[PDB]
Amino acid sequence: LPPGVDALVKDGEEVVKGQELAPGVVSRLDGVALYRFPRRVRVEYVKKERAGLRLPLAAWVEKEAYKPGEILAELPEPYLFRAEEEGVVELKELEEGAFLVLRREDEPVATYFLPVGMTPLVVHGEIVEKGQPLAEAKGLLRMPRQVRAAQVEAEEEGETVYLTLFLEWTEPKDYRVQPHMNVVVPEGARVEAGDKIVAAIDPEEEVIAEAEGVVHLHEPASILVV
């Protein structure tokens, strides 16, 4: 496989003769394709966190859970979502959508979820006071493509709803594998904290799984079609 080029088929996948393995590589025979030496291992780590939101009662659609992409609310007019605690902002941005985490000292005092359609008005490390706008929400706001809502609680205060969302999503981290290293973990494997992913000559440069997650192989050195 040409350097930097990522494979079309995945390790283990049954393959017909003539099928395209890589952008410039076409298979000559039927059989099982096998990854030889993956250069980059992408591990999607499993995170389950409880985060809040407040919306105009008229703009939100009542559901017990939200699948990725599902419409969360439709706002007649632009709405300013405001902080309910004072703290410093830790902004953590997903593919689309964001998480916002307020902390005083180092103890987190609030965790907010900004779905898509909600533009942060704050930046990482900004000091905020109760009632000041964190994010502008304009038009239709929906769940991001990579993140779900497993449980949805709604409290009603005045003209607003406060959603307590139990959110589940995977955060990718990439690891580079050097020629003297071997991947000790299979494609689609589940790893816990401490589990070895890639092995090497000396204890450092080893890849140990940071927390719970699933493993994906990219950029193989070559593909062996058997």
Place this chain on the structure above:
Amino acid sequence: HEIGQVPLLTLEEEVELARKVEEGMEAIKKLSEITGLDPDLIREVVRAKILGSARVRHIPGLKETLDPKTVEEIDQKLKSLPKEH
């Protein structure tokens, strides 16, 4: 011409084979410990099964004649081991 039919190794391919060879030797050591069986004898049974039925013969140092009867017994003794062994 026969030499030219085996492709040369990539640095990656070379390290992989070398790595597996070293590890295989460490494995033979462990099987000696577990079973209380001769490491050399173990190596010939392992090697016999990889090379296939084609080559099976007595080795000058081994105390037992190495024939499909004896290699089946020892191979069946190895396969009688617990999963982690």
Place this chain on the structure above:
DNA sequence: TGCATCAGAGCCCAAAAT
């Protein structure tokens, strides 16, 4: 079935051989 092409088979004796 009839015909080239090639591989393999042979090519004096005795004397001597410095």
Place this chain on the structure above:
DNA sequence: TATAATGGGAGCCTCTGATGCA
């Protein structure tokens, strides 16, 4: 026993019989 090293080298008659192609 440890830089890396990865595919060789010389070459010059007649008849008979079997074998491989019209």
